[PDB]
């Protein structure tokens, strides 16, 4: 037939016309509601569409239970299976303890992830009621978190684990019954009985046939050769979706017993070409554990391999054909079959052949030797023979789920008894536009013995060989070069190893004991965490639960998908979508744009362009952008129009028919095109104190360099989301947005349609996150979706896709500096000169109060006396760069530390003691002037010294050192200073509206906005203890500018302290009012009171506002204070490289961190970890690659490579600084929300460390005071590590990217 | 009475701590808000008309 | 508001006590989370009651804007308005009358 | 309000009335109102949270 049935939470589902291009996340999420499962990027790599699937498995005969991605899951693929969803397993009625954990734990900041991490969770205790430790992590190889730094989540779920003041309470969590969870639907155990049928399914475009038998897909096969077939989707959902390839006919054969079993044979095991790679997984584990070693070493290379493949969602579902028929250039299996000969077998109607793969299996690029009617139905992968051994590699960008930038299968087989070469085989992905075996190289070595000149013949072979040019894809060709030949060091230190374990030790010599740790498999010790804070005084009521760790207050809805984000809103009936339609150059005129295709597409309503604005097409902050493209386009990403329709895919589909017509124009890319073209905007900012040239004349030494600091993506896990509902009257408009500025919002919609700012309502409940993103960048969505909403009379909807908003929206301000600094042969710094330059793209935007932040910042924690700063802001056809939480802050201070490394090393003096010895103390003024009161840096730094046990661990790192030749250990120990307030003083301000309803319940609002930092869990907090009233009685819904007006973004780290303020005065109002009769009645409740004022006809409803006092910074005078307070903190951290790879482990962190009196210590911690955890990302993984046209390579998780549960120091320590009242903020708290972050430059210095370690080691020449760019990734850390392979792989010339 | 416009109620709920936002034909949003809030069993503080 | 012009007579009414024209000030509708604990509109009162109390509103909002319009007497609103904004004084107030 | 677009997954309601002026309720049988397309509900005072 054609009818599709599922189940869903245990309810039929009945679709009659299924379309085979809906997925599972649209079809729960628009045809059932159910808006817990959430899109977060589409293409695999984030989890937070996470859904559990159980079906009966007619081959194994079972239930059986593996989560998928519903984004990539096609619901045609889905007949006769049953999906729980978030919604499935608890509610807030009911809670399932997974949902309960991690709301109680602090697992879920924004929340956006919660739903997908709880279902990764949940699947795995459906298989495994009692997990392991490292089975927990190893559930979330596929789930993202930017908020929580991943430590409470790990946290609070070690409580299920076999192997497993406070922040939580793990005793008062409620145990699991495993009776109680969904029964299988009965229909499905009846159904396991009938005989499966074949299918079809009919969509718009596409055609998917079910095949149920291998006679109907080879049938199939050789009367449509054309018919695409479709396992696990992972690699077609993403040609789909991303690269916009239309298969109109489709096969899925995932039913068919050929394909999908397993046979032990005499020479290896043979899987189906549909078996899943959990499969392939569970059934090569079995063997490695009974077999003997001898005859496994294949086994354990294909196992490494899927050590760091996706996560458990994707390997549930991909299967070992599909991998091996994408024939990607960097598939990490082909390398690995290729070099074992892996025999494949080939059928098509009729006709039957195996192979063994080598190189001829793959003539192309992603070809294959298949014939277009063939299919590949089975792979045997061997056994190992005596004499044989097998390693694989893979070096990415991050170790989890990342693409490779080479990976590698090396297999040699020994004459019996000898140390003689019989076989020798090096295959690589990587290197080229396909899997290729080093063929040239291989043959030279039959018959060598396994020795020194062996070692070095290969390696000279594989330099010559696996040449790469300039302009090759992916570029790091240096670091692509020295890994193949880093990878078979590696591959002969450990056939020495192996050999030696065969007793032929004498025959090619025992291994320097140095050498050792070169051939270790990744390992990490299981995790060890500390949270440390202050207990509240005894006499605190327990209703005042200011300074306790009260959780998130959304936390359990956000746990259980209850919790409503933007898209998760019903649409109207009558709900239009739209998208926008961007330009694919830097800098062109628009000659003209054709819609003729985009108007046949079915549901489509109209293009909007510059025409159609009502009113003003000039927007941003500045009031330099265009609302829509006017006659050119400045970036890749420029807005030009946008197509509405009635649904989304269409939306897609009619903006592909957008045809544009440019006239290119000379761009300017890269800060240096700026500086060349006078590019700018606006004039040169400067700080400067003291006298320069003095400086300078009395300094025993001076070191000049330059460093360079790669931007950053937010990587907000919701993406930015407008819903606009026009009100036909009187140009009313209410807008349901994802937005850390409402009054901006509102501001920029009624300009563009020409009304006043009364007409227009913006509302925000919450977002998935914003981190500075959705300070300004969110508008350009809102004014589109506003001008559709306007123009139709509908609503209208749009959420960014993920490389939608990657590519339009903006980062962190990539910066240049070129620094001088002066200083005694003591370490103590007499005299500073920085230049500062950063690439603001195509309009101001923020650009230059980033600038003036980073400025503000330059001296870190140092008092220096004769300094001088300058900032230029590049103006570049890129998107505009735009706020990013440390708002230039970190950039400045890691310049800052960047040039005190290297007087350090330069004086060969102990960096702490260099530190210590410039630091500022108490009294000291800034460099802009400003006094240092309060100023608990001091102690920060003793405590952090002390509990980490820095000079201790000093001695361990310099002994790990002196025994290992190829690992290397780094340690360093960094402050920070941080300057609360916007730099704009009329900025800090809030506001809030209290209403006391006859009941005595509480409806609070103030301007800030939350996004998951728990800003209304503490303004609740604030405002149960200002009333003295419980928490329970106090609520608030969102933040509206019908409400409060005129409010300040959700920014600078500021929004308790404002709007705390606010709430506590509107509170203070209040109590004055109930004065009288609390005086009447002192013991009556609060509700007598309420009840007693109504009565009386006094008002029960009052504003609160603050400003912040004494503000105000001039730039010419170098006076007046442009922070209100400063934020302090240390990190000490410690690493462990690879020096052959540029893999490194982040073995230890330890923070002490001064928050003041913390109004939430939990919120507050977790704060501290997630800011760290943004700027772990930002200084050693995160990094953008751009074209030299200036098009964003680097669109999606897959390519961009944030922290991952993986990425976090292994023992990860936080306390928060005793004693330490602030008094002149709310409740004598400090903000925390920035200035963490900076912190994470403690593992960067202590990479260095590292690497300075590795060049005494290697290297016949070092170079002293070597270069190390922000982020230091895997390509600069190996890069850096010089030795006897990078001297084998040392203009101008096309390259894939360039340094922006 | 004969007010040419009927008594009409629209009830959004939203899902989270009992909140639900009401359109409604009334003279009395207090009493309205008041009476939804005692049937439901929640605060005041929860329902919006 | 059910037909009676009850809008329309308190934008009349913050009119002329804000000394604004009617054009800069609209009323989008009646909430329970902008104004709580209101009486019904009943009793003929309503224009009485809410007239006070937008009266009482817009005072407050003159007492914040008085050393704007000292510093520029003939400057326009628009000017008093945006340097409040800038000098960071709450452009928002409720307003009561019993 | 009944001019407000409604959302794609809102329901409509209908009051069930007295017939009588002064009576006690017997019982109610909702049989034939269950057969009716897009039924969804019943509500009476045991359904009052
Ligand atoms: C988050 C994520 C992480 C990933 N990580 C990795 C990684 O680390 N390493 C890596 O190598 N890959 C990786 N992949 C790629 C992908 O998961 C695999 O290549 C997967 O094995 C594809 O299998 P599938 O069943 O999903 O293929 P599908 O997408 O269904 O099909 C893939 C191709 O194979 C064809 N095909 C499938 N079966 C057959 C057959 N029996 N005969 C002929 N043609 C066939 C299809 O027509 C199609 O052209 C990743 C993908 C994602 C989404
Ligand atoms: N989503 C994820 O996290 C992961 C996905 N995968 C795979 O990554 C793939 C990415 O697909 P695409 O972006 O289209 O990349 P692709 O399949 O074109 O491979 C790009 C890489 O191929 C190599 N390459 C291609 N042509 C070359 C040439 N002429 N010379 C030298 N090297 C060359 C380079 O190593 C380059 O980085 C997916 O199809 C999937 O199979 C693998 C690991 C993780
Ligand atoms: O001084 C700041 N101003 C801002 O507008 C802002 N935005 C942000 O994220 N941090 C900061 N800091
Ligand atoms: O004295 C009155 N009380 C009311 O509650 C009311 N309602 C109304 O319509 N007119 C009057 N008059
Ligand atoms: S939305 Fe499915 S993995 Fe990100
Ligand atoms: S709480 Fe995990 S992405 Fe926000």
């Known amino acids: 037939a054609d009818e599709l049935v599922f189940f869903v939470n245990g309810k039929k589902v009945v679709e009659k016309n299924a379309d085979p291009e809906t997925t599972l996340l649209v079809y729960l999420r628009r045809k059932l509601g159910l808006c817990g499962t959430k899109l977060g990027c589409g293409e695999g790599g984030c989890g937070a569409c996470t859904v559990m699937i159980s079906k009966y498995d007619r081959l194994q005969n079972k239930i059986v239970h593996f989560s998928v991605n519903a984004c990539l899951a096609p619901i045609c693929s889905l007949h006769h299976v049953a999906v729980t969803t978030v919604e499935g397993i608890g509610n807030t009625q009911k809670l399932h303890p997974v949902q309960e954990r991690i709301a109680r734990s602090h697992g879920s900041q924004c929340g956006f992830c919660t739903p997908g991490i709880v279902m990764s969770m949940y699947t795995l205790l459906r298989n495994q009621p009692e997990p392991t430790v490292e089975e927990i992590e190893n559930a979330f190889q596929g789930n993202l978190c930017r908020?929580?730094?991943?430590?409470?989540?790990?946290?609070?779920?070690?409580?299920?684990?076999?192997?497993?003041?406070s922040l939580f309470n793990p005793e008062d969590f409620k145990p699991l019954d495993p009776t109680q969870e969904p029964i299988f639907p009965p229909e499905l155990l009846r159904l396991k009985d009938t005989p499966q049928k074949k299918l079809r399914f009919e969509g718009e475009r596409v055609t998917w046939i079910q095949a149920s038998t291998m006679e109907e897909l080879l049938d199939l096969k050789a009367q449509h050769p054309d018919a695409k077939l479709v396992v696990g989707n992972t690699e077609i959902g993403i040609e789909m979706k991303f690269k916009n390839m239309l298969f109109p006919l489709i096969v899925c054969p995932a039913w068919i017993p050929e394909l999908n079993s397993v046979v032990h044979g005499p020479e290896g095991i043979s899987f189906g070409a549909s078996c899943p790679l959990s499969l392939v997984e569970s059934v090569l584990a079995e063997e490695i554990a009974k077999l003997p070693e001898q005859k496994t070493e294949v086994f354990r290379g294909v196992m490494e391999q899927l050590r760091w493949f996706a996560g458990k969602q994707v390997?549930?579902?991909?299967?070992?054909?599909?991998?091996?028929?994408?024939?990607?250039?960097?598939?990490?299996?082909?390398?690995?079959?290729?070099?074992?000969?892996?025999?494949?077998?080939?059928?098509?109607?009729?006709?039957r052949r195996t192979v063994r793969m080598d190189h001829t299996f793959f003539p192309g690029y992603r070809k294959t030797l298949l014939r277009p009617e063939e299919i590949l139905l089975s792979i045997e992968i061997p056994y190992s023979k005596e004499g044989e051994f097998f390693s694989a590699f893979k070096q990415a960008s991050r170790r989890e789920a990342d693409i490779a930038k080479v990976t590698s299968g090396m297999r040699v087989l020994f004459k019996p008894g000898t140390i003689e070469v019989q076989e020798l085989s090096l295959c690589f992905g990587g290197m080229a536009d396909r899997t290729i075996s080093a063929l040239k190289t291989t043959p030279k070595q039959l018959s060598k013995s396994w020795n020194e000149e062996l070692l070095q013949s290969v390696c000279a072979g594989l330099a010559e060989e696996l040449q790469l040019a300039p302009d090759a894809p992916g570029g790091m060709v240096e670091f692509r070069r020295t890994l193949t030949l880093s990878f078979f060091f590696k591959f002969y230190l450990t056939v020495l190893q192996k050999l030696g374990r065969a007793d032929l030790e004498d025959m090619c010599g025992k291994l320097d004991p140095t050498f050792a740790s070169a051939t270790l498999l990744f390992?990490?010790?299981?995790?060890?965490?500390?949270?440390?804070?202050?207990?509240?005084?005894?006499?605190?009521?327990?209703?005042?639960?200011?300074?306790?760790?009260?959780?998130?207050?959304?936390?359990?809805?956000?746990a259980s998908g209850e919790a409503v984000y933007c898209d998760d809103i019903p649409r109207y009936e009558n709900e239009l979508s739209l998208r926008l339609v961007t330009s694919t150059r830097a800098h062109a005129k628009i000659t003209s744009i054709d819609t003729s295709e985009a108007k046949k597409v079915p549901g489509f309503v109209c293009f909007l362009t510059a025409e159609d604005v009502p009113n003003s097409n000039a927007t941003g902050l500045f009031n330099d952008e265009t609302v829509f493209a006017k006659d050119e386009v400045t970036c890749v990403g420029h807005i030009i129009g946008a197509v509405v329709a009635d649904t989304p895919e269409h939306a897609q589909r009619a903006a592909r028919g957008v045809k544009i017509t440019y006239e290119d124009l000379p761009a300017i890319i890269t800060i240096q095109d700026a500086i060349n073209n006078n590019s700018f905007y606006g004039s040169e900012?400067?700080?400067?104190?003291?006298?320069?040239?003095?400086?300078?004349?009395?300094?025993?030494?001076?070191?000049?360099?330059?460093?360079?600091?790669?931007?950053?993506?937010?990587?907000?896990?919701?993406?930015?989301?407008?819903?606009?509902?026009?009100?036909?009257?009187?140009?009313?408009?209410?807008?349901?947005?994802?937005?850390?500025?409402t009054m901006k919002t509102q501001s920029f919609v009624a300009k563009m349609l020409g009304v006043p700012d009364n007409r227009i309502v913006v509302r925000v409940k919450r977002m998935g996150g914003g981190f500075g993103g959705k300070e300004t960048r969110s508008t350009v969505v809102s004014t589109a979706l506003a001008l559709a909403a306007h123009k139709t009379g509908r609503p209208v909807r749009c959420m960014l896709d993920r490389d939608e908003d990657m590519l339009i929206t903006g980062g962190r301000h990539p910066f240049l500096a070129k620094y001088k600094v002066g200083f005694m042969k003591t370490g103590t710094v007499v005299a500073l000169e920085v230049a500062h330059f950063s690439n603001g793209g195509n309009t101001e935007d923020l650009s230059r109060s980033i600038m003036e932040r980073a400025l503000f910042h330059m001296d870190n924690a140092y008092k220096i006396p004769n300094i001088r700063g300058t900032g230029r802001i590049c103006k570049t056809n890129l998107p505009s760069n735009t706020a990013f939480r440390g708002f230039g802050g970190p950039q400045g201070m890691l310049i800052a530390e960047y040039w005190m490394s290297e007087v350090a090393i330069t004086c060969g003096l102990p960096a702490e003691?260099?530190?210590?010895?410039?630091?500022?103390?108490?009294?000291?003024?800034?460099?802009?002037?400003?006094?240092?009161?309060?100023?608990?840096?001091?102690?920060?730094?003793?405590?952090?010294?002390?509990?980490?046990?820095?000079?201790?661990?000093?001695?361990?790192?310099?002994?790990?050192?002196?025994?290992?030749?190829?690992?290397?250990?780094?340690?360093?120990?960094?402050?920070?200073?941080?300057?609360?307030?916007?730099?704009?003083?009329?900025?800090?301000?809030?506001?809030?509206?209290?209403?006391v309803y006859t009941d005595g319940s509480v409806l609070l609002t103030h301007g800030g906005t939350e996004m998951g930092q728990g800003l209304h869990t503490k303004m609740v907090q604030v405002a149960s203890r200002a009333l003295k009233i419980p928490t329970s009685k106090i609520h608030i819904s969102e933040t509206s500018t019908?409400?409060?007006?005129?409010?300040?973004?959700?920014?600078?780290?500021?929004?308790?302290?404002?709007?705390?303020?606010?709430?506590?005065?509107?509170?203070?109002?209040?109590?004055?009012?109930?004065?009288?009769?609390?005086?009447?009645?002192?013991?009556g409740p609060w509700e007598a009171w309420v009840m007693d004022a109504y009565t009386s006809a006094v008002s029960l409803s009052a504003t609160g506002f603050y400003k912040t006092p004494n503000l105000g910074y001039s730039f010419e005078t170098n006076s007046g204070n442009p922070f209100h307070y400063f934020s302090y903190g240390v990190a000490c951290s410690e690493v462990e490289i690879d020096c052959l790879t540029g893999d490194h482990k982040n073995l230890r962190t330890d923070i002490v961190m001064d928050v003041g009196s913390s109004l939430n210590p939990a919120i507050d911690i977790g704060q501290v970890e997630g800011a760290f955890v943004q700027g772990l990302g930002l200084f050693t993984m995160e990094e953008l690659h751009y074209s030299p046209e200036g098009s964003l390579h680097t669109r999606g998780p897959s390519t961009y490579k944030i922290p991952a549960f993986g990425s976090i120091p292994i023992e990860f320590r936080v306390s928060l600084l005793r004693d330490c009242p602030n008094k002149r903020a709310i409740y004598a708290s400090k903000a925390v929300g920035e200035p963490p972050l900076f912190l994470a430059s403690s593992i960067f210095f202590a990479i260095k460390d590292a690497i300075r370690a590795a060049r005494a080691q290697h290297g016949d020449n070092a170079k002293q005071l070597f270069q190390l760019d922000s982020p230091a990734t895997p390509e600069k850390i190996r890069n850096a590590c010089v030795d006897q392979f990078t001297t084998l792989c040392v203009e101008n010339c096309k390259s894939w990217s360039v340094r922006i």
């Open 523 to 558: 390992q990490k010790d299981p995790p060890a965490n500390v949270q440390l804070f202050q207990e509240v005084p005894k006499d605190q009521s327990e209703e005042d639960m200011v300074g306790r760790p009260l959780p998130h207050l959304a936390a359990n809805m956000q």
């Open 147 to 165: 908020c929580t730094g991943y430590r409470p989540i790990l946290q609070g779920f070690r409580t299920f684990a076999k192997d497993g003041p």
């Open 913 to 995: 003691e260099v530190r210590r010895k410039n630091m500022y103390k108490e009294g000291d003024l800034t460099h802009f002037n400003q006094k240092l009161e309060g100023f608990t840096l001091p102690r920060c730094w003793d405590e952090c010294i002390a509990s980490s046990q820095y000079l201790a661990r000093k001695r361990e790192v310099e002994k790990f050192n002196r025994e290992n030749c190829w690992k290397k250990r780094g340690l360093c120990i960094i402050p920070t200073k941080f300057g609360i307030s916007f730099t704009l003083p009329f900025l800090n301000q809030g506001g809030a509206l209290v209403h």
């Open 315 to 351: 390997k549930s579902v991909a299967s070992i054909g599909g991998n091996i028929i994408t024939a990607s250039p960097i598939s990490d299996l082909n390398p690995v079959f290729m070099a074992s000969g892996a025999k494949l077998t080939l059928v098509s109607r009729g006709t």
């Open 1042 to 1083: 019908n409400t409060v007006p005129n409010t300040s973004p959700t920014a600078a780290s500021a929004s308790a302290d404002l709007n705390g303020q606010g709430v506590y005065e509107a509170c203070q109002t209040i109590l004055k009012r109930l004065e009288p009769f609390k005086k009447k009645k002192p013991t």
């Open 685 to 741: 900012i400067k700080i400067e104190k003291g006298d320069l040239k003095k400086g300078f004349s009395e300094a025993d030494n001076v070191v000049s360099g330059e460093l360079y600091i790669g931007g950053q993506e937010h990587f907000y896990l919701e993406t930015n989301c407008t819903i606009a509902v026009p009100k036909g009257e009187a140009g009313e408009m209410e807008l349901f947005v994802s937005t850390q500025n």
